[PDB]
Every structure is written in C-alpha cells, then in structure tokens.
C-alpha cells in the first residue's frame, strides 16, 4: 500500500524583476506478511476403555 508524504519547503521573497519556481511531491511504500500455522494430535482408545474415561 502506498502513501503521499506532505509538501514542504522554504518560501521565496516575492519581488519584481524575478519569478518563482514550482516544487514537487513523492510517493511511498508499505508491506506486510501473511502467515499460517496449525497442528494435530491423536488420542488412544483401548486405554480409554480401560482407564475410566476418554
């Protein structure tokens, strides 16, 4: 995703016999990451019926 950084700069002396000059803008950058995880674990069985609960 991008962005526009605000303008800045010095002024000039407004005076005859001379003129002005324009000034400019920029752009910028941004990132992120997409991550993922998970797991699985078993149970047993015969131990469940031997040992009194599941």
């Amino acid at each position: 995703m991008p962005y526009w950084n605000d303008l800045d700069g010095d002024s000039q002396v407004l005076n005859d016999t001379d003129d002005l000059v324009p000034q400019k803008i920029n752009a910028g950058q941004d990132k992120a990451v997409l991550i993922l995880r998970g797991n699985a674990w078993s149970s047993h069985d015969l131990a469940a019926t031997l040992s009194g609960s599941d």
Partner: protein
C-alpha cells in the same frame, strides 16, 4: 500426484492511496502575537501603500 502450488499462478493486490502528514506539530499560538489594531489596518489595505508609517 499433486497440483502442487508451484504450478498455479499467485496474483497480487493493491488498495488506493492514503495521505500521510509528516508533523512537527507547531503552534506557539495563542500568544503574542494576536488581536490586531486598526492602525496597522491603515498600514495594510490600499490606499496609501507602504512602507510603514511613523
């Protein structure tokens, strides 16, 4: 065996621009200066251009 993500094509994304303001938050207002007289008015608007009176 596998369609194997390696083969299929992975697009990308964007979202519209958003402004970002570089800031040195600057006031020092309100203080001197403020609250103008009208005499400096008589030094400001036309007619009778400057420089300043005495």
């Amino acid at each position: 065996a596998y369609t194997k993500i390696s083969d299929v094509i992975v697009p990308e994304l964007f979202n519209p621009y958003v402004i970002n303001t570089t800031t040195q938050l600057s006031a020092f207002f309100q203080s001197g200066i403020a609250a103008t007289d009208d005499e400096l008015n008589a030094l400001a608007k036309k007619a009778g251009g400057g420089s300043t009176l005495n």
